[PDB]
Every structure is written in C-alpha cells, then in structure tokens.
Amino acid sequence: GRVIRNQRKGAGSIFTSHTRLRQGAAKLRTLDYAERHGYIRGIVKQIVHDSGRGAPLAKVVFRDPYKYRLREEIFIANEGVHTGQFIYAGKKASLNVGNVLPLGSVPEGTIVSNVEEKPGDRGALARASGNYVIIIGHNPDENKTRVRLPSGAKKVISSDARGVIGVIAGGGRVDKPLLKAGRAFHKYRLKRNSWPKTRGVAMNPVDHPHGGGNHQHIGKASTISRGAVSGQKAGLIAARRTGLLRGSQKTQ
Amino acid sequence: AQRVTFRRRNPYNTRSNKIKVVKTPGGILRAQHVKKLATRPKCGDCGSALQGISTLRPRQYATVSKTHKTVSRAYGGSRCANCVKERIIRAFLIEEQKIVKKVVKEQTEAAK
Amino acid sequence: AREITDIKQFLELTRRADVKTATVKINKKLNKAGKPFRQTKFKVRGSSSLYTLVINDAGKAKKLIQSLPPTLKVNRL
C-alpha cells in the first residue's frame, strides 16, 4: 500500500517549521578571548516573546573587543533577569542569575540553563520553558563536570562548557488546560504542521499498519522492534515496558 | 446619493488604496487617494514620540529644512531631553566615582 | 499659490528677471455689513509660482497700476 504519514514527514514539504516570525536563533556568545580568560559585560536591552517558543528571549548587547561597535545577542531569559540588567559572561564571572560561566567555576548544587554540550557550541542543554540542569560533581583532573539534565539523565561534559545561572523563564506553561481544539490550533499554527492527528486505527490498510478491519483495532502488538523498517515503525517503538506506570518514578 | 469610484486600477481596499470623498468646484463628488499617515519619530532611549520634530513619511524628510529635524540641545533630534538629563547626570557621577575608586585602592596598595 | 501683502515687496517682484506677465482682476464685493466696494487683485506670474496682492482700497489701486513696469505685459481683467 501507501507511504504512511510518519514517513512523509521527513521530506519536509508541508512539514517544515513555521519560521517567519521568529526572533532568530538563541545562542550564547561565541567563546572568545574575553569569556575564557576574564568576563565581559552586556545589558539585557529587551526581553521578548518568540513565536512558537514558550520561554521569552533576552536581547543582550555587548561591546566589541576588536572593533568600535555594539554586537547584540539573543539569549533565552532566565527567570528574574530584567531590562537594564548587566549580564556578566566569562571564566572569572560572579555567581548570579543571568550571568554565563563555565561549569568548572561553579560549586556543585549550582542551578544552570542553556548549557553547552561541548565548549563553544553556544548552548544546547535545558532551553525549554522552566527547565534547568544541576551541577552534581566535579573531576578537576581531566577537567570534566557532571550534571543532571531535565530528563533525569546524568551526563559528564567538559568543565569549559558554559551555562547561564538560574532557570529558564515561563515555567508552568503546561499546567494550564488547553480547553479547546482551537487553542491547540493556534499553538501548532506557529510551530509546525503536526496537528490534528488521525488515528491509524481509523484509516484503511493502504494507509497504515493499524488500518482496516470491521471493528477498530491494532490486530498485533503495537510494541514495534528497534530494527523495524520505515513503514513499520508505528506505535510503541522499542518499548521496554508498557501499561499504566504504577508507583514512584524518579531516577535512583 | 452621488457615489464614487477608485481612480487607480487597483480595486482592492489595501492600506495603499485609502480613499477620501471630496466636493470639486464642479459641484460633484469625487474620490481622492490618500497617502498613509506619517508616524511620529521616537526616542532612542525611552521610546516616546520626541517633541520638536516634524512628522513626515521618511523620504519626505529630505525635502524639508534642517530645523524640522532637530531641537537645539545636545542629542537634539535623537533623544528626548529628560533622557539626556539622565545621561549627563549619570556620566558625571560615574566619572567622579571613578576618581574615587582609584585613590581608594591606591591607598590599599600602600597600606596592607 | 502664494499671497503677498507688502506693497513694497510687490514692486520688487514686478521687476524680477523672469517676471514677464501679470494681471489685474476686479471684484465687486460688499463692505462690513452695509454697502459694496471695489476690490482689485494684482497677480504677478513669476516662474515657479503666482504671487497675488489684494489691494482693498480703490485709491491705492489706481496709483499702484501707474507704477507697473512699462514693459510688463499686464492683462487687465
């Protein structure tokens, strides 16, 4: 039969990200000479909504060390940072909400955000609204630092990898019921074309592994193997358990 | 009762196709096309429409004398006076307080 | 387009290098509430715009017309 929906997604025709209104990509400062020997100061000049994103952006501007001009950056605003605030960035920066520092220079327990996966990658970890990473240890020989990501995962990255002190703004966005179809409508209208969702169990066999039959039903385990092939992977991929989760979760 | 027609080929009601009805000396109603309204220039520091300064559409400013584009203070047509009080005050004290910090840590480097 | 009201400035106009042609119009008009009177507009046509001077006094009117440059090609009415 036909190419199913989740395969058509990849050719990104009607499926590319709706991008027109976006502020620009959020990114730490390029890791230059200032930030890795000293600190450099900026002013947050505006904190601002970014369509499709949930957390507001901070627009923060710095002087240029090598040329007379301003260079502006787009940060993701940590909660509590504000317009006119001075933002300090560098190895020898001080430990306050809003500043950006290398995880090597912060005590364990430090609560950071937008952290780099490798030094210089201008930020990758915990950027969504409300999210953060905790520093839970250091290993000064072979300078690594060990952190706990929002997913629960613990991971060890370079101590020069940078992050910004505090948590990302907009927390609890998801506490509030969407209430109606229409609010989801406008939600995804500014993201990508993933809404609404026909159940494969409502299609015909041409369309889906789940399609067809004189009652609606999956007709075979919907836990599909990792090694399955395109066209096959619909449902609980690689599922190592299944069913209502009883009892406390949380990584021991 | 006298009705009216657009005067350019564009039939649609777009921002660039605003119309105003007018009585001619012939004693008839006629459409006139109307340019979009100019907005007031704004202050670099605060953002308020800055007083003193004429408001035209941007190219219409190169048709008009220099005094429609300034007030006669420092940062004239650019920042909004109160915003420049602030600038002067803040400059001064900080340049002053800089003298202060130097001589204080000069004493730290001589008594310790 | 323009209007002029300094009698002195007007004679200065009427002799400018481009001012070739000019005209005098006469209007019957009423005075205050009661009677009417004789208004006369002096229009010099300079190159880029038309200056017009309204002398409201029939007296000043006559004498002004005599002062009119004897090469100016005045259109009377």
Partner: protein, 91 residues
C-alpha cells in the same frame, strides 16, 4: 451584587469543557491577569504580556517570570540557593 456563586472569571466558558478544567483554568487565569508589585520602584503595577514576560506600567522595567505568575516557586528557591552558594565563594 455577587454575580456568580463560583465560576468567577470562568463564567465566560458557559457549560463547556467540564467543571474540573474550568477550575484549573480559573486558578491560572486569576494568576496571569493579576496586578503585581514592582521590585524596582514599589508601585503595584506589573502586568503580564505573553507567557513569561512581566512589565511595569510606570517606570517600564520588564522581568522574565513564570508562564502565569511573576515569580515561580522553583525560581525563588533557585535564587536563594544561588545566594547561599555564592556566599561561600567570598567567605
């Protein structure tokens, strides 16, 4: 004259969606539309303007905050944590 025994702002949804959802919405609505205190100048004039953004009418500071409330519990504890942790570093 009390206009509603309990739906409050939530009366605009009529009978739809189910009382429970309307409850949850009610709580965060009241939060987000509320007027808050401004730390910098002291007038209670901080109103929200899109999730996470909190601006002051007078005086004009804008502070990144919670999706529906100026300060988030998590934010707040984190703040003092940082207070605490930094304290060690000069001491």
């Amino acid at each position: 004259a009390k206009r509603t025994k309990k739906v409050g702002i939530t009366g605009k949804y009529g009978v739809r969606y189910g009382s429970s959802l309307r409850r949850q919405v009610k709580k965060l609505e009241i939060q987000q539309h509320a007027r808050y205190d401004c730390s910098f100048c002291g007038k209670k004039t901080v109103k929200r303007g899109a999730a996470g953004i909190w601006t002051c009418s007078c005086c004009k500071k804008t502070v990144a905050g919670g999706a529906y409330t100026v300060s988030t519990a998590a934010a707040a504890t984190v703040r003092s944590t940082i207070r605490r942790l930094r304290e060690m570093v000069e001491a």
